[PDB]
Scaffold this active site. Structure first.
Site, PDB file in Angstrom:
ATOM      1  N   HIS A   1      -7.691   8.703  -2.982  1.00  0.00           N
ATOM      2  CA  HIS A   1      -7.433   8.423  -1.601  1.00  0.00           C
ATOM      3  C   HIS A   1      -8.405   9.599  -0.187  1.00  0.00           C
ATOM      4  CE1 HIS A   1      -3.072   8.975   1.005  1.00  0.00           C
ATOM      5  NE2 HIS A   1      -3.638   8.695   1.691  1.00  0.00           N
TER       6      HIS A   1
ATOM      7  N   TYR B   1       2.710  10.047   0.075  1.00  0.00           N
ATOM      8  CA  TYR B   1       3.831   9.661   0.933  1.00  0.00           C
ATOM      9  C   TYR B   1       4.922   9.758   0.619  1.00  0.00           C
ATOM     10  CZ  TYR B   1       0.074   6.218   2.452  1.00  0.00           C
ATOM     11  OH  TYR B   1      -1.306   5.599   2.127  1.00  0.00           O
TER      12      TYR B   1
ATOM     13  N   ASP C   1       0.709  -1.372  -0.394  1.00  0.00           N
ATOM     14  CA  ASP C   1       0.160  -0.233  -0.491  1.00  0.00           C
ATOM     15  C   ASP C   1       0.865   1.244  -0.204  1.00  0.00           C
ATOM     16  OD1 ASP C   1      -1.818   2.230   1.903  1.00  0.00           O
ATOM     17  OD2 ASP C   1      -2.879   1.379   0.493  1.00  0.00           O
TER      18      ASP C   1
ATOM     19  N   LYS D   1      -2.619   5.872  -4.659  1.00  0.00           N
ATOM     20  CA  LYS D   1      -3.869   6.546  -4.345  1.00  0.00           C
ATOM     21  C   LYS D   1      -3.497   7.880  -4.847  1.00  0.00           C
ATOM     22  CE  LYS D   1      -3.702   4.426  -0.264  1.00  0.00           C
ATOM     23  NZ  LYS D   1      -2.364   4.453   0.465  1.00  0.00           N
TER      24      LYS D   1
END
Ligand SMILES: NC(=O)c1ccc[n+]([C@@H]2O[C@H](COP(=O)([O-])OP(=O)(O)OC[C@H]3O[C@@H](n4cnc5c(N)ncnc54)[C@H](OP(=O)(O)O)[C@@H]3O)[C@@H](O)[C@H]2O)c1
Ligand SMILES: O=c1[nH]oc2cccc(Nc3cc(C(F)(F)F)cc(C(F)(F)F)c3)c12
Ligand SMILES: [Cl-]
Length: 318
Positions: A112, A50, A45, A79
């Protein structure tokens, strides 16, 4: 072990969470994702948010190059970040995520968050007084652009994250809907078990995917330090002792036995290797009821600053 999604694809029920705060060097994501695949994780994931897709993609490609796995054995999620909800930005955002990871497709692409933000280069656009700048976007148009990414083969499956019931219904009832979201990835753990949302998702053929299933990283920038530490819960600790496991393993197994796909972040080699033990034991029906009894509507992520957002998901009952 996998679950069959509503589009016919399969999702491994245990996923590796890759988010680490900016103070963690970017090289760590490469190291730990390789360790996760070596331990047996096959669902990974990540997200634009990120700032690790290059490193996570390198880890996947490393374990393909060394012969450990094939690309088809890995379920990779990214995402779409909230500054890219406007429909013309969706496919370029996915293509940029693919370029960073050097992958031809993602197995899963998620919206997201429903809380659209001002388009631009900043992840968190702020005005003159440090206030986050929201955007108004018809998320049904975002979803149509997601569907086009699936038809183009860039995402095998498409889903959402942090949506409530009302927001899921807005997509599900969209005229001309082509693909339902395969999943809704949401905060889910014994202190916030999402039982009503889980029932709703099951009734719509949508998988619930749990994040912060171990109680979150308790980052002092977005989690109250006085919140109870999930893994110190006395019931989880007693169950861990009974099964000769750990509180984390109890919390992960709980989700698997209630039909929830569960993520687990660890940047620690030993805990990464421990977490795959979730498949080695079973909780009894009575154990599951004890864990159900811990629910207390506790969400670790402090989203109060977004409460005025028209798409804030936590004002509704579920
Ligand atoms: N869609 C979203 O908005 C959203 C939001 C949050 C998270 N997520 C996704 O979900 C993933 C996981 O959620 P999370 O990041 O909140 O963390 P988490 O999975 O709840 O884990 C929280 C902490 O548990 C520790 N831990 C892991 N295994 C353990 C074990 N066996 N025993 C004891 N402690 C253990 C880890 O610390 P160490 O690293 O020190 O082991 C980690 O920091 C994220 O990485 C991200 O992929 C998505
Ligand atoms: O995805 C993640 N991994 O680790 C994370 C740690 C913290 C927050 C995350 N996501 C996120 C979720 C929301 C939500 F749930 F309120 F929609 C809002 C925001 C932000 F920052 F925009 F406020 C970010 C993530
Ligand atoms: Cl980024």
């Amino acid at each position: 072990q996998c679950v069959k999604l509503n589009d016919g694809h399969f999702m491994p029920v245990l996923g590796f969470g890759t988010y680490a705060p900016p103070e963690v060097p970017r090289s760590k994501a490469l190291e730990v994702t390789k360790l996760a695949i070596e331990a047996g994780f096959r669902h990974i994931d990540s997200a634009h948010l990120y700032n690790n897709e290059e490193q996570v993609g390198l880890a996947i490609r490393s374990k393909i190059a060394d012969g450990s796995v094939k690309r088809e054995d890995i379920f990779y999620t990214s995402k779409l970040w909230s500054t890219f909800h406007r429909p013309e930005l969706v496919r370029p955002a996915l293509e940029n995520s693919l370029k960073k990871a050097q992958l031809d497709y993602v197995d899963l692409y998620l919206i997201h968050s429903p809380m659209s933000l001002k388009p631009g280069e900043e992840l968190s656009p702020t005005d003159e007084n440090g206030k986050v700048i929201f955007d108004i976007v018809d998320l049904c148009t975002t979803w149509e652009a997601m569907e086009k990414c699936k038809d183009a083969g860039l995402a095998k499956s498409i889903g959402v994250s942090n949506f409530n019931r009302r927001q899921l219904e807005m997509i599900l009832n969209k005229p001309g809907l082509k693909y339902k979201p395969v999943c809704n990835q949401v905060e889910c753990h014994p202190y916030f078990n999402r039982s009503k949302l889980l029932d709703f998702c099951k009734s719509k053929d949508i998988v619930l995917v749990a994040y912060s299933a171990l109680g979150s990283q308790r980052d002092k920038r977005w989690v109250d330090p006085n919140s109870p530490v999930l893994l110190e819960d006395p019931v989880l600790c007693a169950l861990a002792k009974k099964h000769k496991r750990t509180p984390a393993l109890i919390a992960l197994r709980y989700q698997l036995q209630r039909g929830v796909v569960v993520l687990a972040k660890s940047y620690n080699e030993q805990r990464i290797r421990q977490n795959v033990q979730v498949f080695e034991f079973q909780l009894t029906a009575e154990d599951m009821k004890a864990i159900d009894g811990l629910d207390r509507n506790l969400h670790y992520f402090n989203s109060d600053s977004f409460a005025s957002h028209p798409n804030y998901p936590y004002s509704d009952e579920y």
